[PDB]
Structure formats: structure tokens, C-alpha cells
Design a protein around this ligand. Sequence first.
Ligand SMILES: CCC(=O)NC(=S)N1CCCc2ccccc21
Length: 284
Amino acid sequence: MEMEKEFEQIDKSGSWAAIYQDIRHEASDFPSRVAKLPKNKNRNRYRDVSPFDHSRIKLHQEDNDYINASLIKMEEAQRSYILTQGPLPNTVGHFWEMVWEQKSRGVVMLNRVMEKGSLKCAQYWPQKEEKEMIFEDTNLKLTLISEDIKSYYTVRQLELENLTTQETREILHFHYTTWPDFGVPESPASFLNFLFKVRESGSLSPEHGPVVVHCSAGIGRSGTFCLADTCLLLMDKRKDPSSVDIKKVLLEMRKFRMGLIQTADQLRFSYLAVIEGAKFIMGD
Ligand SMILES: CCC(=O)NC(=S)N1CCCc2ccccc21
């Protein structure tokens, strides 16, 4: 069923809360035993948001390999993403270790460091060129190279050095600065404009490790970004673009990380973004 007609049918019947609960009911439940070990309590921002054991990212160290991050592999789509929480004061070094070990080119940040008067994530990147950051626990150095500030978002060029080997890589930081918490972007338009900038960068392409995507918990805004990207890619690839079922794509992605799309209003925006984006995919 053309998602645009499904959309108007749910909107006119006001049944978004009902569709959403149906997905919550059918979603996968897999064990998260490593996340719940006592030694890992301070590595989790939220008690009720954990990576599944089968899809968790492992840090390459014998001490403790745990980070709150999941590998989302989307089969038909040919795309991978790492979804993670906003780093904590004691996990900023683990975060950059993971970026290094997984060979990621991009980091996509969908939250502000402070929202609703509380800290939603650590200040994990340098704000000035001449004030670099050293992560002594993981032996990494991070330097700000350049910053391009727009109205809705900011792109930064960062240099990450492995202090052990003196190899360096360029990381691109894509920071959406205007998305409300348990809320939605105001127009599908600024969201999509941002998604197309990440794509243009090469950050989502198979020659790199998976893009790292986060918000505060790494399920809500993060889920919206990956869901919209994957649905638009499948519409590009298939003979019949109207065969893309957003609810079925969301359930496939929930096999890899719990709780993706955290409100009935976030799913609706997901639709709008895919539907408006199609206008591009189908040749405009
Ligand atoms: C376990 C892998 C798997 O079976 N994936 C399947 S069926 N689909 C079909 C529809 C939703 C979707 C979206 C992006 C990529 C793949 C898929």
C-alpha cells in the first residue's frame, strides 16, 4: 500500500498511537547480559536502554570490551550503522577508541550537549583549534581542524591520532543542533537537507567503516535518521518503490537495537521524510 495513502488513512483516523503500540508489541527481545554486569553500571547512561549481546560493538581490549553501542546491518539495503548513546564523562575515551577500531569516517550527532536544562552528553570534541584533547585511557589525540556553522547544523573536520602508532585520520562531525527531545524536526525539509549532506560526504559509503550515530539514548532521533536513510535507499534500488513498507523496515532494524523510534510523533515524521525524499529519488 502506497505509504502516502497509508499516511492519510492513519492521520484522518488519528491512529498513530495504535500503529506505534503494534510495533512495540511485535519488536524483537534478545538478551543484554553484558550491559547488565555490575562492572558496566557506569558505562550506561540509561538503565532501560542496552545493546543486545548478539549485535553489541566490542572494544579491542582484554580489560573490559563493553560500550553501549549496536551494529545495525540492513540486508536488502546494503548499509550498516553504529547506533550509540551520547558519551559519558567516563566513556569519551571508549567512544573514540570505537570510532578508530571500526574505521568510521563520520559521526552524526542529533542532540545539543544541554537540553531542557540538563546535560544530555559529554563535551567529547574540542571547541578550539589550539586546545586539542588527549584521552589517556585509550591513547588517542583529537584536534579541531575546521568548523562550518549553518542555522540548523554545523559540520566539523577533526583529526584523530592513534598515539601508539602515530597514524592519523580525518573524521567528519555532522551536528544537527535544532531537534527537540522526545520531539521532531519542525520541517521534513531541514532534516532531509542534513541527511543529504552526510551522504554527499562519503561517510555512509561501503569503502568506510559504519557511520557512528547518536542522540542522548541512541534510539529515538538516532532511529529516525537510519530508518529514513534505509527506506529512501530501498526505494532507489527496487523495481517497485511502492513495495517499501516503513513498519517492516523498522521491525528489521529493531532486531539489532531495542526501542528505535521512541514516540508515535517520531514515526509520522519518519513517513513524511521518506515520502518527501521520494520526490528526489523518483527524479526531481
Ligand atoms: C535479517 C536481514 C533481513 O532479512 N532483511 C529484510 S527481510 N529486509 C526486507 C524489508 C526491510 C529491510 C530493510 C533494509 C534491509 C533489509 C530489509
